[PDB]
Amino acid sequence: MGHHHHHHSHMQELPDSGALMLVPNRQLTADYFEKTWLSLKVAHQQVLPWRGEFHPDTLQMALQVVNIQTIAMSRAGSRPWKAYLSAQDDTGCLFLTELLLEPGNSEMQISVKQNEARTETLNSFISVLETVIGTIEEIKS
């Protein structure tokens, strides 16, 4: 007796053809990030209605899993919740990101500005952000 069930599910995700490998590389100081942010202009800005309860701890830790370094971040319950992220791809382009969560409104505005802007790098970088944010708004996938 005792019905034992060992569910075997051996997946394997192969690296993408257009291989954008985002490394943290240089941890940018508050001073350096500030200067470089003001030195660049917002390349993309995306407005998204945040789904349900917000968790900055969960968001930050998932960003770390996808090699996105956290420059600055506000606390849970604190609005306007703003955070500054950075990354750098394997081809040496520097990425600067902002996350803004409105005072009374459940609206998150993502402001991305990289130094040498490619259409591919910008789209793929945001796609990483979409996956991180979405998986924390809706818990299943």
Curated annotation (Swiss-Prot):
Where is the stretch described as Ear? Answer: 12-141
Q: What is the effect of changing residue 71 to A?
A: Decreased interaction with TEPSIN
Tissue occurrence = Widely expressed.
Compartment(s): Golgi apparatus, trans-Golgi network membrane
Part of the full-length chain shown: 610 to 739 of 739
User: Which organism was this protein described from?
Assistant: Homo sapiens
Q: What does this protein do?
A: Component of the adaptor protein complex 4 (AP-4). Adaptor protein complexes are vesicle coat components involved both in vesicle formation and cargo selection. They control the vesicular transport of proteins in different trafficking pathways. AP-4 forms a non clathrin-associated coat on vesicles departing the trans-Golgi network (TGN) and may be involved in the targeting of proteins from the trans-Golgi network (TGN) to the endosomal-lysosomal system.
Q: Relate the outcome reported for changing residue 37 to A.
A: Decreased interaction with TEPSIN
Q: Which family does it belong to?
A: Belongs to the adaptor complexes large subunit family.
Disease / disorder: Spastic paraplegia 47, autosomal recessive: A form of spastic paraplegia, a neurodegenerative disorder characterized by a slow, gradual, progressive weakness and spasticity of the lower limbs. SPG47 is characterized by neonatal hypotonia that progresses to hypertonia and spasticity, and severe intellectual disability with poor or absent speech development.
Give start-end of the signal peptide. Answer: none
Indicate the quaternary assembly: Adaptor protein complex 4 (AP-4) is a heterotetramer composed of two large adaptins (epsilon-type subunit AP4E1 and beta-type subunit AP4B1), a medium adaptin (mu-type subunit AP4M1) and a small adaptin (sigma-type AP4S1). Interacts with TEPSIN; this interaction requires the presence of a functional AP-4 complex. Interacts with GRIA2; probably indirect it mediates the somatodendritic localization of GRIA2 in neurons.
- According to UniProt, the name of this protein is AP-4 complex subunit beta-1
